[PDB]
From Swiss-Prot, chains A, B:
It holds the Pfam family Acetyltransf_1. It is found in: Cytoplasm; Mitochondrion. Gene3D superfamilies: 3.40.630.30. It comes from Saccharomyces cerevisiae (Baker's yeast). It catalyses: L-glutamate 5-semialdehyde + acetyl-CoA = N-acetyl-L-glutamate 5-semialdehyde + CoA + H(+). This is N-acetyltransferase MPR1. GO terms for molecular function: azetidine-2-carboxylic acid acetyltransferase activity. Changing residue 132 to A: Increases the KM for AZC 20-fold.
Length: 226, 226
């Protein structure tokens, strides 16, 4: 079987000054926290390697979060092609509730898709060793600590692409991920933007945290998924 | 004479949720610090309103700073059209050594152009009331505190476009503007990115400061240019 879908040689729009630390990204399998439910995280170097129907589901999933207006700075929904260009500009990950090590076509994404996230350079080339990431969790799987697992996969994989440091620009203080996930994994609150965001359902502007984490010195307890 | 070149109604790609606080931006005249040399800052809402030969000079001026590799995260020089699209995406300012209140054609930009800067939203629409700016000072006018004057013009004008807060994402710690300008005008060091940038002539990666400033509550001593 071809392994092109897994090869870091196929990274697009990655860091300029640093090469990948592995030649491939192998699917990573773990259990949802406190359960026997198996999940598998899959690398996505190019949209052609995942089923179109999964992209359709993710495009809708992101637009739902944009339309709610509490978590991203985007105001308007994207088109399906806009989503593809945006989520998959560089690298991405999809996490499925499955024990398979490949992605099967036409699954019931509504229950099978746990979450997804992108990884791309946060800045232009001289600072491109700093990666940004954005996360989405299927609402049908809320309360199962999917977000925390996505972040562990992120810690495992981002440095393999050659990134040395992680920056999130806008984690709103009202986003529970800040304290449920980022703080617990020892991401530093490296900054705070006061009144950063005009959010749906909040009459006052909402502060945002700037999170940083050194990707070359990760605590092993956070990388282990057992 | 037409005042279209000065009208805030002609702002492009500005803040989504807040309107301009003035209907026009009038040229601002002051002296270079400690001298009798007159300077005038002019708004630029669209490149068509300034002479092409000035755009050519600025395109080269930015590429010189990119090529030196110490101040911007860009690695590669832009084309003239790339520069126009980038510097003038939204609003910009040019500061000339002149007492005239319009921009004349074919001047000796090498001595006449003091500096320039852009102002645009730093983020997507829900956070678009936070503006970013980038500054360039003509090397032939180093040591005359041009940079500090550009920042005072910035403080005077950015809130007129509707911005409420200012963010600079990457002011490298080796950039003397941090302490000569930003600190002195009470921009807060709201964050620090360690090892942020791979800079020409520095063998170690270089830290960058994230600067923030509330544009609705500016000290009047910093706004006065007398």
């Amino acid at each position: 079987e071809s392994i092109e879908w897994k090869l870091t040689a196929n990274l697009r729009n990655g860091p300029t000054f640093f090469q990948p630390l592995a030649d491939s990204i192998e699917p990573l399998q773990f259990k949802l926290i406190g359960s026997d439910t198996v999940a598998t995280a899959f690398p996505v170097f190019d949209t052609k390697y995942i089923p179109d129907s999964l992209i359709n589901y993710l495009f809708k999933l992101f637009n739902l979060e944009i339309e709610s207006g509490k978590t991203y700075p985007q105001l308007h929904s994207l088109t399906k092609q806009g989503f593809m260009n945006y989520w998959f500009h560089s690298f991405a990950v999809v996490v499925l509730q499955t024990d398979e090590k490949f992605i099967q076509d036409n699954q019931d994404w509504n229950s099978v898709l746990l979450g997804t996230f992108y990884i791309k350079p946060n800045y232009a080339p001289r600072c491109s060793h700093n990666c940004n990431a954005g996360f989405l969790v299927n609402g049908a799987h809320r309360g199962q600590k999917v977000g925390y697992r996505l972040a562990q996969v992120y810690l495992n994989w981002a440095p393999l692409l050659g990134y040395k440091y992680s920056i999130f620009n806008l984690v709103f203080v009202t986003n529970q991920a800040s304290w449920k996930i980022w703080d617990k994994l020892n991401f530093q609150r490296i900054g705070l933007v006061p009144h950063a965001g005009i959010l749906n359902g909040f009459s006052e502007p909402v502060d945002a945290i700037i999170y940083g984490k050194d990707l070359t010195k990760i605590e092993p307890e956070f990388l282990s998924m057992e």
